[PDB]
Design a protein around this nucleic acid. Structure first.
Lengths: 49, 102, 110, 48, 145, 116, 154
RNA sequence: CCGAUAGUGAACCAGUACCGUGAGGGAAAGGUGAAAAGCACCCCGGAAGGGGAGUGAAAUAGAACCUGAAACCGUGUGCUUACAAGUAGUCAGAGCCCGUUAAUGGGUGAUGGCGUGCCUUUUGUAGAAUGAACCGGCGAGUUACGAUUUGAUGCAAGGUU
RNA sequence: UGGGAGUCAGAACAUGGGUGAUAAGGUCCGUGUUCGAAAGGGAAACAGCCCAGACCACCAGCUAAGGUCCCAAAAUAUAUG
RNA sequence: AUGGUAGGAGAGCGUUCUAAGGGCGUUGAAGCAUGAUCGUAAGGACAUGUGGAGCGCUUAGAAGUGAGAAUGCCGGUGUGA
């Protein structure tokens, strides 16, 4: 192949999901966390078990 | 003299030499189109079709298969982070009438 | 034919200079000079200096006659301000403002 | 005691329409020198 | 925007009509008068321009009420002073300034816009059978039942 | 590597400012209140594109009622007669015929009448 | 914010009088500094299986051979380094601008001859790599080097 | 990896002006031009400033010196406005002026219809609930290690360092 | 079967009930609808009521709930009280 | 079939940098300003002025990758006048 004609295998690569970057993503304001509570908070969540 | 034609889903009032704009047709520029659904014919004599007049065509010559001016469709819901922005350009075809038969 | 003069960084506020500038715009030079002599405002002699400089420029550099001239444009623009912490009051700030004055004078032809 | 809304340019310049200087009289000195101030023997060549 | 006619000045011609209020009912006269004044009777009606004709009402004292509206049916107004509300009955207003009665009844049926005020300025209402506006050559108009 | 916020903010805001041309005062100079108005403007236009058709049908019907009451006929009875006689003609074309050629309008009012 | 100089004390009282509540002048919303999630010193290298590595090399060479971009010669007889003579050699052999030349083990003379020419690269059979194979448009080998790569990849 | 609000607190006068009794805290501030050739001389003016002339490729490159955005302040004009109730726009629409990336064009808008900003928090907000004077810039799910599960590829009773 | 969530403040209307005083835009359960998260037409204006669920154009047409004197589209319609 | 908030899935536009290839530029690059242009959207060109040296395009790859709100921080500038 050529370095200027490089192409990965189909299905090998996806773009990551970037949170907190506007409304039209569907991940903008709350960033998937919902509104309030212990899990909305940074470092929040409750330990496993 | 003048005539009421039906094209698209609407009715248009035409005279000879008149330019009209109409929903898109399946013809090309320079060609000749014939409207067959005529409802009314005026002038000296008058003809009133019940639906139509049993004949009574209108010939015209095609120009400018084109697209209309862009409109930007915008909507939003105020307190809810929901909006939509779209564009639209409606197609048209221009014609020049040359003769109306009755 | 237009002759112009500008005075930059005058220690007077544009709001104050424009009041007297509004009287002389569109006038003849002699009557404008008279108005400026008869107005008692701080900016009158400054504007007089600028006007006479413009007329001298017309007479020397362009060889126009000063008897048939009129003030065509006359304006003041803002220059850079100077900040001063007023000690007399209670820790307030005071902007000393300044103006760029311009007048241009013409014979009315081409 | 304090303004609840800022003042727009329109309102400001409407209020500033009567805030200007009148024109003096300027009776032209018939005697000599610069033009005299009316009813004033002006220091700068007036003869009223 | 295909073809639809739009009247303007240099297209429209206003006329002059005379209506006799004798033996007529107030509101039933005033509705028709408002329609004439606004131009609903015309085929060139456009709402953003004063298509419409002039109207003259003449007698205005033979105007009739039904029921006990002569003593009931009180008109009110307020001076924008405290307790500055004032009243008057329709019979009193009929035998005293009956022109104001009809003109207010018709201006209530017209809208409160600029065009509506201009259209109400086209109403001339008198008391008695004589009017001055003979120079305009008015036609008599009969009311529809 | 670092990427700084260059020229895209300015372009994005500027074209909104340009859409806000002709507005009153700060609404053609300031990005926030200009943007707020443009959104509102588009919503208004969306609903007015639909109000337009209602308004014009209303106009045509008023004109036809006027034209019929000269021939001593109401809109309602005229259109019932038209429907019964078969006429499938628009209210718009009817209005324009009534304005242009009164004679033809009378001629089909006769048909609307004799179909009853 | 912990590595930025200063920022120890709280710049004003929690309630203040009419101000926003703050804790240090080196917080990230301050002009002074404090980066939240920036780059960190790290490595990007990763590994994959030896079989895949060998397969990639074989596929590169097979592409270069089926594109008619493979040339094989006898030995290079360079008793001294001469970029000019190597240029004439690559003129005689109708080679493109980008060419990779593969010796068996090491020839300092031909290396020095071809070092300064643009587009040309010199490599050993053991030191072959997919990158400098694919970047090239042609591949000249000595017979010994060809046999060596054949045995170590077969 | 940063490229002057970044990157050392500090590209320059830096742990300096400045604050604090003291321990201590702690800034802002880069760019003429290839070359100083850095405006001889004349004119207005007390001078500052300027107008010519001249150097220069260029002086709206003149030391408050590359580029020079917006807020903000003005001067001129084409359309418009002193009987009018206003979330200031939108759809319709005369009249007047202009003439484009030339396409069923542009600017203004007599008049008619419709129409209570945005964000957050809420059962529910035009809300007299919160926040924003305006403008610009900066400003928030990242990296390492491990687990789990999906997709890709290689090999396969073996696979892998 | 597995990967990823958010939610655990609910409101009115109608109907079956407790409580209260056969009071509450009250409160607590149950059965449906709507709002929440739903624009449009009607109810003068009015989240929750009636009609009905907006992919986008059109100066085309048929209807729903509600209506046809003027504001303001459509009967100053017919017939009987 | 296509109303939609917590939220799940998918496809894309732009920003800085790197590799390779292929290009533009004192016969004037990027930036800035204007415009009646193109695209379903993010957004992309062209022309003319200003400016006076660097910058696009294709494919892939990495991120300090997109702000209108935090009594946010820093600078300029208003209002009250």
């Amino acid at each position: 192949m050529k370095l200027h004609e490089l192409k990965p295998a189909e299905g090998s690569r996806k773009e990551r999901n970037r949170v907190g970057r506007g409304v039209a993503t569907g991940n903008g304001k709350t960033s998937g966390r919902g509104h309030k509570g212990q899990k909305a908070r940074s470092g929040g969540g409750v330990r496993p078990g | 003299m003048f005539a009421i034609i039906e094209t698209g889903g609407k009715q248009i009032k035409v005279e000879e030499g008149q330019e009209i704009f109409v929903e898109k047709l399946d013809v090309n520029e320079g060609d000749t189109f014939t409207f067959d659904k005529v409802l009314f014919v005026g002038g000296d004599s008058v003809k009133v079709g019940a639906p139509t007049v049993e004949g009574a065509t209108v010939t015209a010559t095609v120009n400018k298969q084109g697209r209309g001016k862009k409109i930007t469709v915008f909507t939003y819901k105020r307190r809810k982070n929901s909006k939509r922005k779209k564009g639209h350009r409606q197609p048209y075809t221009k014609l020049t009438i040359d003769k109306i038969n009755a | 034919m237009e002759a112009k003069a500008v005075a930059r960084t005058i220690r007077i506020a544009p709001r104050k200079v424009r009041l007297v500038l509004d009287l002389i715009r569109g006038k003849n030079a002699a009557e404008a000079i008279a108005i400026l002599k008869l107005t008692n405002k701080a900016s009158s002699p400054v504007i007089e200096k600028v006007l006479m400089s413009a007329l001298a420029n017309a007479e020397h550099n362009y060889d126009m006659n000063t008897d048939e001239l009129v003030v065509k444009e006359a304006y003041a623009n803002e220059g850079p301000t100077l900040k001063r912490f007023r000690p007399q009051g209670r820790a307030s700030a005071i902007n000393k403002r300044t103006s760029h004055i311009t007048i241009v004078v013409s014979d009315g032809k081409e | 005691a304090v303004p609840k809304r800022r003042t727009s340019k329109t309102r400001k310049n409407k209020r500033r329409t009567h805030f200007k200087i009148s024109v003096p009289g300027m009776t032209e000195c018939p005697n000599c020198g610069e033009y005299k101030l009316s009813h004033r023997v002006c220091k700068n060549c007036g003869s009223y | 925007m295909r073809q639809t006619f739009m009247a303007n000045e240099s297209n429209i011609e206003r006329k002059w009509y005379v209506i006799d209020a004798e033996g007529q009912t107030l509101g039933r006269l005033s509705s028709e008068v408002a329609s004439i004044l606004r131009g609903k009777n015309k085929v060139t009606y456009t709402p953003h321009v004063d298509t419409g004709d002039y109207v003259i009402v003449i007698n205005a004292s033979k105007i009739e009420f039904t029921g006990n509206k002569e003593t009931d049916k009180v008109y009110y107004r307020h001076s924008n002073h405290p307790g500055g509300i004032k009243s008057i009955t329709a019979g009193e207003l009929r035998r005293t300034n009956p022109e104001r009665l009809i003109e207010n009844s018709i201006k209530g049926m017209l809208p409160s816009t600029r065009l509506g005020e201009k259209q109400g300025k086209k109403l001339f209402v008198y008391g008695g059978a004589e009017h001055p506006h003979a120079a305009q050559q008015p036609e008599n108009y009969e009311l529809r039942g | 590597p670092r990427v700084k916020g260059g020229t895209v903010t300015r372009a994005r805001r500027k074209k909104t400012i340009k859409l806000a041309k002709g507005y009153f005062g700060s609404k053609h100079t300031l990005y926030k209140v200009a943007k707020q108005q443009v959104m509102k403007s588009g919503q208004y236009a969306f609903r007015d594109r639909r109000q337009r058709k209602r308004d014009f049908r209303k106009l045509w019907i008023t004109r036809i009622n006027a034209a019929a009451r000269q021939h001593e006929m109401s809109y309602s009875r005229l259109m019932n007669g038209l429907k019964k006689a078969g006429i499938d003609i628009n209210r718009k074309m009817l209005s324009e015929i009534a304005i242009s050629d009164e004679k033809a309008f009378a001629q089909l009012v006769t048909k609307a009448k004799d179909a009853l | 914010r912990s590595a930025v100089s200063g920022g120890g004390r709280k710049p004003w009282k929690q309630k203040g009088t009419g101000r926003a509540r703050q804790g240090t002048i080196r917080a990230p919303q301050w002009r002074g500094g404090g980066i939240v999630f920036g780059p960190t010193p790290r490595s990007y290298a990763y590994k994959m299986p030896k079989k895949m590595r060998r397969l990639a090399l074989r596929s590169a060479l097979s592409f270069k051979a089926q594109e008619n971009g493979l040339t094989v010669v006898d030995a290079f007889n360079f008793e001294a380094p001469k970029t000019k003579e190597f240029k004439n050699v690559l003129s005689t052999l109708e080679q493109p601008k980008k060419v990779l030349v593969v010796t068996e083990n090491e020839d300092v003379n031909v290396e020095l001859s071809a070092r300064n020419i643009p587009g040309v690269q010199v490599t050993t059979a053991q030191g072959l790599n997919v990158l400098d194979i694919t970047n090239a448009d042609s591949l000249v080998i000595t017979e010994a080097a060809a046999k060596k790569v054949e045995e170590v990849l077969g």
